[PDB]
Design a protein around this ligand. Structure first.
Ligand code: NI
Ligand code: NI
Ligand code: NI
Lengths: 252, 63
């Protein structure tokens, strides 16, 4: 019966408000082991589960190029402590918010998007967005606190995201990312190894540390691309913004 | 190349050529919606590729 859920989103996206709405008085504050940043946790029930809700610090992405936020969030997500995530998104700023969303969905951890500030926003076809992402999209009008039940329902029912190829990256980058992924320990699931490879090429200082036996293989990866791609990192970010644009266009 | 639109590279190249530009200029010259442009700039900024200038908004290349 226990389910651990991580709560993540961009800063100023209504993440704290949603955190309060779900837990109320059942909150405990501490710190992320080994650092000073506060770590807030809460408890609540669904009509199947006893949920432990871990608040992750507001973050624009999972890439660490001095903020610990991207690092903490990324480290926590990679640890496997959470069975699933609630990604809080500001409907009035999908162009900025979906970068984090895409990074999470590509990584493959089960997700439920809590679509916020739907009134502050443009009109969004919620179902199309759900289809484009491969995961549920639950609308919330927080000022009123509605949809919390739909969100709970989703937590009990959602098991795995639709297996979609969301982003189109240049062949060379995928080639090298897989080369890197082959050097990472087998305790890291296949899909996450490929993801870490791309994060390394993107310039993520942490994913590189987390990849151990490959950290020192990135220079040869960059040299192997010196022949084809000029700025690897810019290409990976660009590739992601290509689908963000496609998605935003198709649903807004 | 997905689509036929704004490439972060395109934004880079453009700025490399013009030295500095207002975000609105980029949105017109590149035929890409302003919110998309704004988000792309911030991303490149966070990566340390472009720099924002206070003078309103000038965007140019470097750390
Ligand atoms: Ni369960
Ligand atoms: Ni750890
Ligand atoms: Ni290229």
């Amino acid at each position: 019966q226990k389910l651990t859920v991580g709560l993540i989103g961009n800063p100023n996206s209504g993440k704290t408000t949603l955190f309060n709405q779900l837990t109320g008085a059942r909150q405990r504050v501490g710190n992320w082991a080994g650092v000073t940043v506060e770590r807030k946790e809460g408890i609540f029930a669904t009509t199947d589960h006893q949920v432990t809700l871990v608040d992750l610090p507001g973050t624009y992405s999972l890439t660490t190029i001095t903020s610990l936020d991207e690092q903490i969030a990324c480290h926590y997500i990679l640890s496997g402590d959470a069975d699933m995530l609630i990604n809080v998104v500001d409907a009035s700023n999908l162009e900025r918010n979906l970068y984090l969303t895409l990074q999470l969905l590509e990584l493959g951890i089960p997700c439920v998007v809590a679509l916020n500030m739907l009134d502050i926003a443009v009109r969004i076809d919620i179902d199309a967005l759900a289809a484009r992402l491969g995961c549920p999209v639950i609308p919330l009008v927080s000022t009123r606190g509605r949809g919390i039940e739909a969100l709970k329902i989703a937590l009990d029912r959602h098991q795995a995201n639709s297996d979609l190829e969301l982003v189109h990256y240049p062949q060379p980058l995928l080639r090298e990312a897989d080369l890197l992924a082959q050097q990472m320990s087998a305790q890291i699931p296949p899909r996450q190894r490929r993801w870490l490879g791309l994060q390394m090429l993107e310039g993520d200082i942490y994913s590189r540390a987390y990849a151990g036996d490959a950290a020192d293989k990135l220079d040869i990866a960059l040299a192997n691309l010196s022949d084809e791609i000029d700025d690897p990192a810019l290409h990976i970010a660009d590739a992601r913004y290509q689908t963000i644009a496609a998605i935003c266009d198709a649903v807004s | 190349p997905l689509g036929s639109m704004a490439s972060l590279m395109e934004v880079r190249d453009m700025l490399a050529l013009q030295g500095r530009m207002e975000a609105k200029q980029l949105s017109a010259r590149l035929q890409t919606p302003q919110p998309l442009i704004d988000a792309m700039l911030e991303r490149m900024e966070a990566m340390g590729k472009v720099v924002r200038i206070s003078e309103q908004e000038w965007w140019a290349l470097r750390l």
